[PDB]
Every structure is written in C-alpha cells, then in structure tokens.
Design a protein around this ligand. Structure first.
Ligand SMILES: *[C@@H]1O[C@H](CO)[C@@H](O[C@@H]2O[C@H](CO)[C@@H](O[C@@H]3O[C@H](CO)[C@@H](O)[C@H](O)[C@@H]3O)[C@H](O)[C@H]2NC(C)=O)[C@H](O)[C@H]1NC(C)=O
Ligand SMILES: *[C@@H]1O[C@H](CO)[C@@H](O[C@@H]2O[C@H](CO)[C@@H](O)[C@H](O)[C@H]2NC(C)=O)[C@H](O)[C@H]1NC(C)=O
Ligand SMILES: *[C@@H]1O[C@H](CO)[C@@H](O)[C@H](O)[C@H]1NC(C)=O
Ligand SMILES: *[C@@H]1O[C@H](CO)[C@@H](O)[C@H](O)[C@H]1NC(C)=O
Lengths: 172, 321
C-alpha cells in the first residue's frame, strides 16, 4: 500500500494474533507477550463496515419493463430492445468492476494507513527513550517491566520518568 | 539490558483473492461476495400477488377462452405465463399482440363490466365447435359473435359514452371467413366492414375472405383490436358485417403490475425479487441470475463473482518448505 508498512517495512503479519487486527509484541527481562490494540483495530473495522453498508444499500425497485427474450424474429424494434438491454448491462457491469477495484485499493490503503498511524503514535509516545529499528520494532533503552509495557499500550507512558536512564544507554 | 517493542498486524492461514486498481489478483484476510449467482428455483408467493397462468396466456384469459374462465376478474402484481399454455377457442390473431399483452399486464386486472349494447336486427351469442363450452358450441366469454337475423344484417350503429372518471378498455374483433359462402351465409353482405371510433381516433378494418391453416375445425380467423375510451369521450361502433362485438369494458388501472415468462414453481416463502429462475435474495447489489427481474432486485451484471475486500492485505510468515 501507499504507506509502506503492511507488506513493506513490516515483513509479515501474525497468524497468532486472533483478538485484534493490529497490536504489540514485546521482549523484556520478564519474557515475551502479545496484545491487540483495540482502537486501531476498531478504526479500520468502522471504515470497512461503513463502505460495506454504503455498497449494499438497496436502491432500485423495478416493475413493468421491456421484454428481453423473444420467440419470433421481428427486426428493427426487437434490435433496439436488445441493444438497449445490452447497453445497460455493459454499463452496469463496468460500474460493478470499477467499484470493487476502487473500493479494494482503498481498503488495502486504509488498513496500511492504520498500521502506520499506530507505529507513529507509539514512536511519538516514546520520545527519546527508544529508536526505530526499521522493521516495525522499537528498541527501548531502559528496563521496561510488564507494567511499563502496558503503560505504552494503553497510552499512560510518562517518558520523563525513564528519560535520564534511557539517554545514557543511547549515547555511550 | 533493554527491551524490544514490535508493532504488527494480523494474518490468516486462508486468505481470499480480490481485484484492485493495480492487481487483478491480490490476497486479503477476508472478502464478501457482491454478485447473487444462485436462486431457490421457486417463485415466492409473498409479498407480491403472483397469479399463475397455468394453461392460460394473459390474452386468452382476457378474451375468455373457456379453460381460462377461472381467471375472470382476477388481479395480479405479477402474472406468470407458463410454456405449457395453449389456446382452445376460435383461432385468432392480435395485430400488435405484444402491446395489448403489455398494457393489460401493466393494468394488473381483468375486471370486466358488462354494458347494455343494443344490437338491433342481428342474432347474438354465436358460437362454434372450435370453442367448446360444456358439451356444446361456444365462444370467448367477453366477445359477442353477431350474425344475421332472418335473412338480413342491418347496418349496426351503436354508442357507449364514458360518463365514468376512469379509462375503459374495449376489446373487439373482426371475423375473416374462409369462403364467400361462409361470409354471405353469416352476414348477408358480400363484404363486411367494422369501424370503431372515439372523438379523437378511429380504426376501420375490412375483413379478408380466404383460407388460413386449419386450427380446431376452422380455416377462418378472428382479428382482435382494442380501443381505450377516456372520461368524457364516447365509443361508436359501426358495421355492416363481420363484427365480433364487445360485451363491455375492462377497467384500466396503473400500478406496479407486470407479467413474466417462467416455469418455476410457486412456493410459500417471502422474497422481494423475482426472476424467471425463481426468487433471489436482494442483500447483494448485483446479480448474475437473469436480466429479467421484477421487484426490488440487484442489478444484473455479466460477472458471476465480484469480491469486495473486508480486510487488510494478507501477508503470512515466510515458508521454510
Ligand atoms: C349513429 O349513431 C350515433 C350515436 O347516437 C349518431 O351520432 C349522433 O348524430 C346526431 C345527428 O345525426 C348528433 O346530433 C347533433 O348533436 C348536437 C349537439 O351534440 C346538436 O346541436 C345538433 O342539433 C345535432 O342534433 C349527435 O350529437 C350524435 N351523437 C354522437 C354521440 O356522436 C349518428 O348520427 C348515427 N348515424 C346513423 C347513420 O345512424
Ligand atoms: C437462469 O435461467 C437462464 C435462462 O433460462 C439461464 O441462462 C442460460 O444458461 C445457459 C448455460 O447454462 C446458456 O447457454 C444460455 O444462453 C442461457 N439462456 C438465456 C436465455 O440466457 C441461467 O443459467 C439460469 N441461472 C441460474 C442461476 O439458474
Ligand atoms: C469473513 O467474511 C464472511 C463473508 O464473506 C463472513 O461470513 C465471515 O464471518 C467473516 N469472517 C471474519 C473473521 O470476519
Ligand atoms: C366482475 O366485477 C363486476 C363488478 O366489479 C361484477 O358485476 C361481475 O359480475 C364480476 N364477475 C365475476 C366473475 O366476478
């Protein structure tokens, strides 16, 4: 996609993540773990539901129309009837084809966008206490116990607390 | 002794292919079908009033072919003509069959109101072995075959004003005998004529004597014509022979009514959209079942499948095997 995160700098997805679309994996002194981010997940799902409901919204109800199958050869009037129906069907077929192409390109891009939004939000939260490894991971430069990790994930990480500790590990 | 925090997204074992602007096939975590490609095989009997023609075309029910008398005064949202339908009365043609069928189908009713036409000096209620009604000869229920009385067929001149506030549809005909002997036997005059007029329009038909192919005991034919009389207007029928007179008029309406050719059986279920293949659901915006439809239907398209991505790009772990 346009943001280069999904199928880009992030090598691949996580089949193990079953409770969310986007999320976090960590390694610290206490071990490894995983948690979904509910907000980025929901922003993607709300947008997808939004476009789905727009596409499937009923709009035509038709009753008496022209005949479209014919048992006799009649010539000019029947040629016009068939041409009209065939014109219509091609125009609608085209609309259908274009619609899904545009919708799907956009769906791929907005989901890529949400991955990137979460990555930039996380990076700004950490300030100077971590560095971008380039592969979708931050190397955090201080002791970050499980309480500290969950502080990052639920938006309560005070970077000032760990800054002096972290700044020293970075510039030596 | 630091810590790594990795951002990421989910993947699934079994993704789906979709089309985009740049790729004809690319894999995503899920997608949803936008083309309805299947049907039950059955026309649902709700919520639209479906009237099964059984052995009858709409036109035979209109005219009142005896095996179609059960359709008298019927109404419909959708009249369903079956391929097994057959005619079994006097052989006839309708110049502009398609238009009469269309305007009756659209009107949605066969409500007939009998009117007291006075046919002075002719015999009414003529019949034929071509059109059996019970054990003996008969004719279309809504038409009145006039023939000579004694040995005269006088000039018929009658009037029927429309003092109502709705359009009246009159169905009438002209008899084309097979021989001159039949013509003069039935109508005295060697050449009949039928003139049916309103204030604004007129139709005049000269009958044409000659053999057609034998159908149900006769080489003769009837030709069916129609005339709509508006509120305030007047019908005049003038003829010196060969008139197949109306007995009254059909009440015209406008609405949602139509007609469809189909052999799908009618079943007890609920479906807004009807096709000749049967009913289809309308939760999807497009359909590939049939270009002929009635009701709230998806739009017909040529594609049998179109997948709308409902998930991100699916990127699995790189395989070691
Ligand atoms: C065949 O029958 C029709 C229907 O009755 C006859 O039409 C009527 O013809 C008379 C005159 O022949 C018309 O009378 C005129 O009416 C106006 C006012 O409307 C009046 O001011 C005149 O003094 C005159 O009497 C009458 O309107 C007309 N009616 C209709 C409905 O058209 C027709 O004459 C008959 N013809 C034959 C040969 O039998
Ligand atoms: C619905 O009915 C239509 C017409 O009865 C089917 O279309 C025909 O399908 C065959 C292939 O199976 C084609 O060769 C014909 O050209 C089609 N006929 C017409 C008149 O279009 C259609 O397949 C049916 N679809 C479903 C889902 O039942
Ligand atoms: C994926 O889409 C299908 C419809 O195409 C739906 O029935 C299914 O429940 C969806 N699964 C998930 C996990 O969203
Ligand atoms: C048809 O309707 C009219 C009045 O609406 C009625 O007089 C007539 O007898 C009806 N015929 C049948 C067969 O129901």
């Amino acid at each position: 996609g346009l943001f280069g995160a999904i199928a880009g700098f992030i090598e691949n997805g996580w089949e193990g993540m079953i409770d969310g679309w986007y999320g976090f994996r960590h390694q610290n002194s206490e071990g490894t773990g995983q948690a979904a981010d509910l907000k980025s997940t929901q922003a993607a799902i709300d947008q997808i539901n939004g476009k789905l409901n727009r596409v499937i919204e009923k709009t035509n109800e038709k009753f008496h129309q022209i005949e479209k199958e014919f048992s006799e050869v009649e010539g000019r009037i029947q040629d016009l009837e068939k041409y009209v129906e065939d014109t219509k069907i091609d125009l609608w077929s085209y609309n259908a084809e274009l619609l899904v192409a545009l919708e799907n390109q956009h769906t791929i891009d907005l989901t890529d966008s949400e991955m990137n939004k979460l990555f930039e939000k996380t990076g700004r939260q950490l300030r100077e206490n971590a560095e971008d490894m380039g592969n979708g991971c931050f190397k955090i430069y201080h002791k970050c116990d499980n309480a500290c990790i969950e502080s990052i994930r639920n938006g309560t990480y005070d970077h000032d607390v760990y800054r002096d500790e972290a700044l020293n590990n970075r510039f030596q | 002794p630091g810590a790594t925090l990795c951002l990421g997204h989910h993947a699934v074992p079994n993704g789906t292919l979709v089309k985009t602007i740049t790729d004809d096939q690319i894999e995503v975590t899920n997608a949803t079908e936008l083309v309805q490609s299947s049907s039950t095989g059955k026309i649902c009997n709700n919520p639209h009033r479906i009237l099964d023609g059984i052995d009858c075309t709409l036109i035979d029910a209109l005219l009142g072919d005896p095996h179609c008398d059960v359709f008298q005064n019927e109404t419909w949202d959708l009249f369903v003509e079956r391929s097994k339908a057959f005619s079994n009365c006097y052989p006839y043609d309708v110049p502009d069959y398609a238009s009469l069928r269309s305007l009756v189908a659209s009107s949605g009713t066969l409500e007939f109101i009998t009117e007291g036409f006075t046919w002075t000096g002719v015999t009414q209620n003529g019949g034929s072995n071509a059109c059996k009604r019970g054990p003996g000869s008969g004719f279309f229920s809504r038409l009145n075959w006039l023939t000579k009385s004694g040995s005269t067929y006088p000039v018929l001149n009658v009037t029927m004003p429309n003092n109502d506030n709705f359009d009246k549809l009159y169905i009438w005909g002209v008899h084309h005998p097979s021989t001159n002997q039949e013509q003069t036997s039935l109508y005295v005059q060697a050449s009949g004529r039928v003139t049916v007029s309103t204030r604004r329009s007129q139709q005049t038909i000269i009958p044409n004597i000659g053999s057609r192919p034998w159908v149900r005991m006769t080489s003769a034919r009837i030709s069916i014509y129609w005339t709509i009389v508006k509120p305030g207007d007047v019908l005049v029928i003038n003829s010196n022979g060969n008139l197949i007179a109306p007995r009254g008029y059909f009440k015209m309406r406008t609405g949602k009514s139509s007609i469809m050719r189909s052999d799908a059986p009618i079943d007890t279920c609920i479906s807004e959209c009807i096709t000749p293949n049967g009913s289809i659901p309308n939760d999807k915006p497009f359909q590939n079942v049939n270009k002929i439809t009635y009701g709230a239907c998806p739009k017909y398209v040529k594609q049998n499948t179109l997948k709308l991505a409902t998930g991100m790009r699916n990127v699995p772990e790189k395989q070691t095997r």
